[PDB]
Symmetry: D3
Subunit: 317 residues, 6 copies
């Protein structure tokens, strides 16, 4: 592929005005309160996996809307407490719960839980579908911040941290949140809504600068929003949709992140355009660093893996 978004020089300076409504923090305050009203009631069931030195489990817990969230949980097979990681998977990109990577994270020394995102890689989503929406999760319940798909997801992410930190074999002071694109977005959103995480690693975070994303993205899933408007021409629906999205946009959440953060971005990424990622990064006011990779897009970036491992090792291991 090739360069397409703003020049690197412009990207570094790209910092769009926040779109957060006056009731932004109030919405998250209320949302967190509804989550708190749901007892976690976590369950742990051992799971066989052909690995030595790691114990794998299937973890489930109750979250927003009384939804049962799941994911594999791998723990180093040695005395703890262990530093932990809550890993979030990409949009519709979870295969068999990403169990093999979860196990490898545990082999690296981290008690790791790969929270499966509602209705995607796993987990239950009790939230009702208010009405029509484009193919996908991007616009489900988009006409209201209370019904929006990611409201439950973000909360599940926070609840995931609360459950993990409660584990006695987990060192609550050494918990990191990581993920790619959608996963990176959940990581950042979790760090913004909970102070449990110590550090944050986000690979080309998704759900960022929506109003620009729909005009710059050249591939799914941002375009699901575009597809949604094509099916609902009502001008008010568009205003409303973007109004809803602002409550979940990383450029509005970034400011709450106080944890050391490591981000990555490929300049030829057509799914999460550089501009939208730099936008999130430029709204972060915390110990941070953005690794830029000229020749990579929305994919695994080997050089960034080293960075990631090194960063987590330094702050947690």
């Amino acid at each position: 592929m090739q360069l397409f978004d703003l020049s690197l020089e412009e990207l570094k300076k790209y910092k769009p005005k926040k779109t957060a409504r006056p009731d932004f923090s109030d919405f998250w305050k209320k949302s967190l309160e509804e989550l708190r009203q749901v007892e976690a009631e976590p369950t742990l069931e051992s799971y066989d996996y052909p690995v030595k030195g790691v114990k794998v489990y299937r973890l489930t817990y109750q979250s927003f809307g009384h939804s049962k969230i799941e994911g594999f949980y791998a723990v180093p097979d040695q005395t703890g407490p262990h530093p932990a990681l809550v890993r979030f998977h990409g949009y519709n990109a979870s295969y068999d719960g990403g169990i093999h990577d979860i196990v490898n994270w545990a082999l690296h020394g981290y008690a790791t839980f790969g929270m499966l995102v509602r209705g995607q890689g796993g987990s239950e989503d009790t939230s009702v579908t208010p009405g029509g929406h484009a193919l996908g999760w991007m616009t489900k319940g988009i006409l209201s911040k209370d019904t929006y798909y990611y409201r439950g997801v973000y909360l599940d992410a926070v609840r995931a941290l609360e459950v993990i930190q409660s584990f006695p074999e987990v060192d609550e002071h050494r918990i990191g949140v990581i993920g790619g694109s959608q996963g990176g977005a959940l990581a950042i959103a979790a760090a913004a809504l909970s102070d449990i995480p110590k550090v944050v690693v986000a690979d080309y975070p998704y759900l960022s600068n929506f109003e620009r994303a729909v005009d710059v993205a050249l591939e799914q899933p941002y375009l699901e929003i575009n597809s949604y408007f094509r099916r609902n021409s009502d001008p008010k629906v568009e205003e409303k949709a973007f109004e809803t999205l602002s409550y979940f946009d990383l450029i509005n959440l970034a400011g709450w992140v106080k944890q050391p953060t490591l981000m990555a971005i490929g300049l030829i990424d057509k799914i999460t355009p550089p501009s939208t990622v730099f936008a999130a990064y430029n709204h972060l006011e915390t110990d941070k660093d953005l690794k830029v990779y000229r020749y990579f897009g929305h994919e695994f970036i080997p050089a960034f893996q080293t960075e990631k491992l090194s960063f987590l090792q330094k702050h947690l291991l």
Copy 2:
């Protein structure tokens, strides 16, 4: 270009039903749960730049207490009028297909375009049991009780019950029509309800799943393939296909007693000819399948005439 079975083979393609022993029992129970939900329909007039037709926004309660909607256009003249319940295609509803609904009314039919749950409109209260591929095709696929289309099919039946209750509607002249997903709902509705008089289905979807996933070259059948890629458990595949059989047209076709008109393009890559012939060949009723060599999953002009002529003859 041509790709599925030859036309000669297609005419003879009739795969063994995959219906489980509790097939009709499942639908009997499902219809019963629907019956337990009062329709409580509502009608709100809706402005539209047309003369001779009155448009409304119709809503009603269905399975799972979901609120189903759709525009309802009625010829602006004394009834009773023959009616049509039109079903839209998969993720293919734009602005409720209001313009086509209105035109159907201009053709003389009191028409209701039922919006399919979470797609073109309507509420879907059914919970998402677990992970599934991007789309609706695999939502709740691990159980016939939780499967996406269970609610949809019931909404379709309820739509007919609501429409026929209207005094301006001639209950004896109600037809069900639709394209692909819409065609599948039409056929499924006729199989579960005797309210419809005739059925028109354009290259019906949700048919012969086990073959569709091996022949289709485009979405949305492949959503199932994507689902299995994400859940390699062999039991998950057995289960999924077990679930799908309760909604597969080749198992429902047999219950259709209404005159039925179908269409199929031989280069259709979304609803492969074989899967459509399969549904057609399982129908034991007054039927006819219009084959169009040079068309695919799209509007077929020649079939519109056929369609208008068929509906006119049985309803107008």
Copy 3:
């Protein structure tokens, strides 16, 4: 896909200098005169169609070059006079004469005639092919305004209006011309050459700002011109071709339109680039309005249908 032409802000101000030669109106004056010399001699043959309340016919008439033009003609089955519509189809986009849409227009209350464009959806084209040209109609007889394909077409469009208005069941004071792409172009061209039309509706009009179109378009049929030049490298051939096209370019004809006009444009339209459509719109000095649709391209735009029906209803019904 995604945005690609000039920004919306720029589009609103895009008004390229007319390319009309000094003999512009003289060419059309002469052309109209040659048309006038051909007796219409229209014929009406009833045609069976499964519809109630509408009578369909096959209408044919003689036009420029003694070509026999055809098209279905649907009339509300009630006492007239009826408001009428001359509908023009898109480039190579006529299927079975667009009869189903013609009938629906009649059901909406309009005596409608879908003029089939020469050699495309129907009708005879007696104009000779002077020499080589690219695959398609875009460059047929392009080396001279007298031989150019659209000369006959535009005249057929005018003649269509003359024939329809002559019908006793047609209210000559309530005739509108409509069409999409090529059809929108014929609509606008007909209103510029004839004062018979009362109103004009054009969906992303084609044949506009050719010199820019060949540099911005990303799909057919504008690129047929590009293909033509690839096959005739002679620099003079290119000057000549554009010289010819200027006599049919909407930016040069728009100024003659005095009828209320309604236009539409999708910002991601790659066939008739937004710039070329805004160009035509910005050259119109009449009661006008351009509906912009951010998320649509060269296709049916539901929201615009309402606009269209509402516009025609207000001016004709």
Copy 4:
């Protein structure tokens, strides 16, 4: 691209039943007669070209429907008579009259004329457009053999041979017709309608076995027919169309070819499917040979150029 049509074993045996109507030869007899009624009145205008040893001209002549046909004509700059070639270009594939190739053919020793196909690479087409048709020339006037686009084209091809052979610097007994795709079809059609040509070279000939082509081709321009039917659903239109096409189908003309013929075909050709080309070849009853190239499609095949040059050299230059 990859293999897709019938297996090579099947292709060699593929010989579809002729689709020629009972008035087939009568149609061509009448058609040739109408051509004969139009005086050629050829004209020759010298044309400058940066080459040594060759004289280039612009050649024009009157043909069917009084259409003015053109094309460059290159002649070796030495005393004749010279062996000649009438080269036909591919569908919508003529750039600047293919002048550079015409000149090279002359450098190879052949007085060469690249007849430009009506409305495509050049030449005038006076034939009227009866009615609607798909984008392209494939379906123009397809509802009647008298109005069909290629009627004039085929006749132009024959007239081209008559004009060329009349030239004193041309050895009428050493004239070959060559072409690729559409050009190969015109070559074969010209040899079938005129005995002027001595030999024939056709690269993956087009306009062959229409009824199958529309079901096997995966690219233009055969699919123009498919597009046409999509726009005219009337079943009678399809019967008529194929009726018309049969009068121009190579499988029905091949049998009249008596000249030595050399053909080529790439097995991954998606424009002129192998089956449709083998069909034309298998209907030829004359000194013939079909060069098969497994790894090539609808494109220039180097190995076949050698074959071609060698074949022409043997039958004409030699």
Copy 5:
């Protein structure tokens, strides 16, 4: 994608006749002898990597043609001997030496060496380029088994095993060879030429049933061969090329494998078509098993990773 090759029923029975020439084993006997003549002279240089419990090194050694082969070598940071793995990467698919995966393999308890294939993911290739060839490595030196690209590669693979087993911290009786596509092919080839490996894991092995692959494959890199023939039309070149390829074709090497073998194949794999993989599998006469995945292609198959980890654990780790 979608199904396209032979049906599963046919695939299970697909076993093409070997194409090995009469001097097959003689060629490999001589080739191994030339390798033996090159002293390994391995070198080990520690390499920093952000991991705990594993020591990483850059390993290099001399192989066929005195080429210096490299790759990262990760070892569990605990007392050995350790079971080992020689991992081979896919065609042009090595990024930064696949170091992250090498380390993870070591975390699973395996002393792992990711041999970088000549000129691809790393390593030196001293073999000269005899002449023209298609873009890529597939046809380099294809006109002779002595000059063919993979001759050196296969030998590097065998040498890799010899070097690893010589390490004192490596349990020579618990060495496994694994790889995907090209990597799977090297794994199988190494087991066929060396008895050092105990078990073999090959994910949809490449370099198998060449003569069919070039007719079934729909993506690179098999088609490089097709591209090569397009550029060298000489019929003898094709005979020669396939003659050369037979000495490296898995269907001819499979028979020498005596080690327990685990293979995988996606039925919609367009790079290494199912038929070509079943062909290699059906030529294996040893403790074997082929995991078939209906919905996967040429990619990472999660279900097969479990199979793989479980298989290696059973035969090596525990």
Copy 6:
């Protein structure tokens, strides 16, 4: 379609040279290593169905003792004849481009189509130091001494030395021509040898690398991008570009003193207009760049006339 800098900008695009301080020293040493290899050319007649031309297989020894080949066609008449050394495009040589070589001879030019190492033919003895992206673009890219094109450029020069030594060849009327990669070799040959009288380069490749990798939308420039994806080490990228500068046309152009004719299509995605104008704008010699708005990386008929006319004027 248009995509690079505007034509107005292209005419002014002249990027700073990237030549290292040892630029000419590298080429001086390189030419010296070539000189140390005796040409030892061989000529073997080759049958070809043509009249008036004699074809031969020509081979000679070059840098690294590599045996370079190519067909050589000579007008079958008394010489001396003007000559042409034709270079083929990247991976674009089929059967040695023999048919074109013959046609060039028919136009009156003793022509030799040098086959580029390992591509259209010829032997490449240069070792592969290490890993590199699929293709020749990055082979030995970590050092100017090992880089693929070092041998190629020298083979080009050696080709001229061999041809001019032929008695039937008029050493004062030798032109070098080629497209893209071939155009680049032509220009590089004219820069390193004064044997060529004139130069014709069709949209020359290997030009302004640092921009090419950011503007190109097709192969083979992107091979470099692929290389960096496989070797993330930042130093590897600095080194690679350091290597490439020794072969970049923007750094060699200045040495060209021969009349030069270039062509460029404005929609060329393989050799972007900017990279070609870059090479052109670095030429300080009798020159001319033919711009073709509607063409890309392909045969441009109009330019063929230009080309034939230019060569005729300077050589015939």
